[PDB]
Amino acid sequence: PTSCNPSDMSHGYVTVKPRVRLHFVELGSGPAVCLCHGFPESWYSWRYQIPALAQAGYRVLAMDMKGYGESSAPPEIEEYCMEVLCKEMVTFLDKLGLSQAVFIGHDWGGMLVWYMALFYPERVRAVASLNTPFIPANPNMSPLESIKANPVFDYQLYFQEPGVAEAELEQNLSRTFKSLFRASDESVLSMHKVCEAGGLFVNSPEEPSLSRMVTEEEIQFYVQQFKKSGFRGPLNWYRNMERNWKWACKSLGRKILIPALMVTAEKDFVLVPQMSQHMEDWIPHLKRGHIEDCGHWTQMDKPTEVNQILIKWLDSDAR
Amino acid sequence: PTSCNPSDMSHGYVTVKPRVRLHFVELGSGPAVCLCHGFPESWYSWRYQIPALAQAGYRVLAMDMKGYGESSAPPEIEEYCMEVLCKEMVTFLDKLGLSQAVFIGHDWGGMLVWYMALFYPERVRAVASLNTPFIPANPNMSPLESIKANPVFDYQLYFQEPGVAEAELEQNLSRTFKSLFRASDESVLSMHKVCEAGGLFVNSPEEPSLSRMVTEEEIQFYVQQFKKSGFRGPLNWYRNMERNWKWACKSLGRKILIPALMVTAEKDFVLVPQMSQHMEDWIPHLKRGHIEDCGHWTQMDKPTEVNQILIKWLDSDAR
Numbered sequence: 151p152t153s154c155n156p157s158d159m160s161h162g163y164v165t166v167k168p169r170v171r172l173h174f175v176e177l178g179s180g181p182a183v184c185l186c187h188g189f190p191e192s193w194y195s196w197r198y199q200i201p202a203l204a205q206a207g208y209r210v211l212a213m214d215m216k217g218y219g220e221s222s223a224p225p226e227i228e229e230y231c232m233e234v235l236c237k238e239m240v241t242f243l244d245k246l247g248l249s250q251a252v253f254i255g256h257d258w259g260g261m262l263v264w265y266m267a268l269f270y271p272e273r274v275r276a277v278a279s280l281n282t283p284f285i286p287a288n289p290n291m292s293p294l295e296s297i298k299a300n301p302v303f304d305y306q307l308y309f310q311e312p313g314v315a316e317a318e319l320e321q322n323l324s325r326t327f328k329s330l331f332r333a334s335d336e337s338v339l340s341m342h343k344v345c346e347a348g349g350l351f352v353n354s355p356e357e358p359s360l361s362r363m364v365t366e367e368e369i370q371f372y373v374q375q376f377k378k379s380g381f382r383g384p385l386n387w388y389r390n391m392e393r394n395w396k397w398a399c400k401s402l403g404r405k406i407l408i409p410a411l412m413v414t415a416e417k418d419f420v421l422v423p424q425m426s427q428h429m430e431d432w433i434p435h436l437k438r439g440h441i442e443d444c445g446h447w448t449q450m451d452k453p454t455e456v457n458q459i460l461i462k463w464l465d466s467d468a469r
Numbered sequence: 470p471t472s473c474n475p476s477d478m479s480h481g482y483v484t485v486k487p488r489v490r491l492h493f494v495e496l497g498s499g500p501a502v503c504l505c506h507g508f509p510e511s512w513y514s515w516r517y518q519i520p521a522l523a524q525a526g527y528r529v530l531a532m533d534m535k536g537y538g539e540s541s542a543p544p545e546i547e548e549y550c551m552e553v554l555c556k557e558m559v560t561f562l563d564k565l566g567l568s569q570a571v572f573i574g575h576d577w578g579g580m581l582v583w584y585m586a587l588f589y590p591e592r593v594r595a596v597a598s599l600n601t602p603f604i605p606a607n608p609n610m611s612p613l614e615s616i617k618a619n620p621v622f623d624y625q626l627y628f629q630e631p632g633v634a635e636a637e638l639e640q641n642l643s644r645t646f647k648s649l650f651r652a653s654d655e656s657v658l659s660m661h662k663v664c665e666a667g668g669l670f671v672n673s674p675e676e677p678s679l680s681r682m683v684t685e686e687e688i689q690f691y692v693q694q695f696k697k698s699g700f701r702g703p704l705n706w707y708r709n710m711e712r713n714w715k716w717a718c719k720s721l722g723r724k725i726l727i728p729a730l731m732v733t734a735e736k737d738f739v740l741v742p743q744m745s746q747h748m749e750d751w752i753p754h755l756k757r758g759h760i761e762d763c764g765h766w767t768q769m770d771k772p773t774e775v776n777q778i779l780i781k782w783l784d785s786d787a788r
């Protein structure tokens with residue numbers, strides 16, 4: 151599928167707060183579709199979707215989320231809680247003069263678009279998440295109790311204290327992204343042996359091989375971007391579990407009423423399909439997509455399939 | 470009417486050639502409307518139109534034309550001929566993934582959108598010019614002969630040799646813009662005594678008064694921008710008369726077929742309404758607007774009237 155050359159794009163910048171400006175890439179005409187990547191990614195993670203959606207009749211805005219790439223990376227950890235992040239995206243729409251947009255996210259980005267749909271449905275024409283499900287906040291279950299429940303979520307504990315995961319992730323960026331951006335069958339990480347035996351990459355190859363999903367050129371683009379601000383800002387998306395929990399609790403007792411799409415990935419072994427089992431009771435107008443042989447990095451892994459699911463869903467529920 | 474605060478806008482950048490990048494301001498959703506200012510202006514000259522068009526259902530892209538503001542200002546004089554300028558605007562659309570846009574221009578910008586309509590009608594949904602008429606090139610009349618015919622066009626002779634007009638225009642920028650941006654009844658310039666008696670401002674007040682059209686704050690914004698690249702780039706739009714003439718001649722014998730609007734200003738004493746007298750024979754689907762009591766700086770002078778004319782015309786001929 152057609153990808154993007156970064157220098158052949160239109161680049162947009164919007165100031166949402168005094169020292170915070172968001173950067174995005176824009177292509178196409180028609181209804182606005184805002185794409186929100188996950189950790190640790192970039193607008194470039196949507197490179198196979200951007201020209202496909204534009205060609206289908208949509209105006210695509212692919213974000214560099216806060217902390218990433220050309221967007222500002224404020225130092226404070228609380229700048230990366232979901233409450234602040236969502237209101238900045240509302241300001242973003244305001245500054246662009248957009249009454250609403252379609253929101254499509256993946257990973258942390260998918261969590262963000264769910265909460266955009268939940269607290270600002272007025273500004274969200276339609277919402278779609280890849281991998282990330284919407285589970286209502288349990289006001290009786292603290293976040294630490296639920297993380298320290300399912301063992302696959304232990305890498306988030308290693309991500310908590312500032313400076314620790316930054317050091318491992320920044321020490322060699324080419325190794326970091328070549329180790330992460332892999333299909334499920336090529337995976338070199340055990341996300342559970344994380345917090346009692348070194349770190350993320352302690353038992354990974356020092357010079358890992360290049361996944362079938364990516365070229366060397368695409369690895370070096372990610373490498374170049376995370377040389378701008380490093381991994382602190384991206385990691386701070388994990389370091390507000392308790393505030394996100396309290397904020398999410400303030401909405402308990404309301405459903406998401408707008409058109410919605412949930413796309414699950416068979417081989418995403420952390421955000422497993424089954425975690426989405428009962429979103430129908432909270433999201434009455436939910437449509438579904440499901441992709442076989444697809445790991446976590448869904449847009450890179452199965453670009454054709456995701457393109458067909460999104461366009462099919464946009465043409466029937468967003469327009 | 471609602472204006473714009475510059476820092477509350479979305480700013481876009483597109484690279485159309487190796488050392489040339491165009492800057493624009495963007496607001497709204499709906500059909501694309503590209504606004505192209507004149508000499509010596511800025512995207513800010515459309516400040517009263519941008520929020521009005523967006524509110525009427527249009528996606529506004531207000532350009533900093535080449536040589537101006539935040540857009541690149543290459544040094545070569547030939548970079549500012551109409552042939553190069555128009556193809557860069559085509560590349561601009563390409564990079565944004567826009568099959569076509571509405572083009573609205575004023576002054577030199579209006580000349581540019583006429584030639585966009587003439588050589589690239591496929592990419593122009595509809596075209597509108599304020600003040601600037603479309604007169605077909607006369608292949609028997611050299612440009613110097615026709616300028617040295619009507620005496621009001623003698624300031625263009627003073628603009629020819631590089632460095633001369635730059636010095637007068639840059640010596641005090643606050644004086645330059647306060648002397649230019651005036652209603653017809655407040656005018657301090659005789660554009661004909663230009664080339665045999667000093668220059669543009671030799672018999673103008675050293676500290677001119679502030680026109681009823683503008684505040685001090687708006688003057689200082691123009692002042693701030695023309696501190697970036699100066700007046701050379703803007704002046705170079707006048708220094709390719711013979712190439713524009715030869716290029717325009719290569720199209721003789723064709724009409725402009727697309728929907729079109731010509732807006733004349735009663736008190737524009739250089740681009741007088743009567744210069745547009747016979748554009749109907751070359752532009753069959755031409756609509757007209759006309760604004761009384763309006764000088765050259767049409768968007769600043771009569772903002773309400775221009776807003777009503779454009780929106781009325783867009784809703785019936787562009788959508």
Ligand SMILES: Fc1ccc(CCNCc2ccc(Oc3ccccc3)cc2)cc1
Pocket residue numbers: 189190257258261282296297303330339341420446
């Ligand atoms: F190989 C890889 C590489 C990166 C990842 C990132 C996945 N993390 C996204 C995410 C989505 C929701 C989150 O909120 C919580 C928090 C606690 C419990 C349940 C949900 C926290 C993180 C996964 C595998």
Ligand SMILES: Fc1ccc(CCNCc2ccc(Oc3ccccc3)cc2)cc1
Pocket residue numbers: 508509576577580601615616622649658660739765
């Ligand atoms: F007070 C002011 C301040 C600025 C201006 C600028 C007006 N100039 C725009 C323009 C439009 C077409 C042009 O092409 C020619 C060239 C020769 C003959 C006929 C048309 C040349 C310039 C006027 C009055």
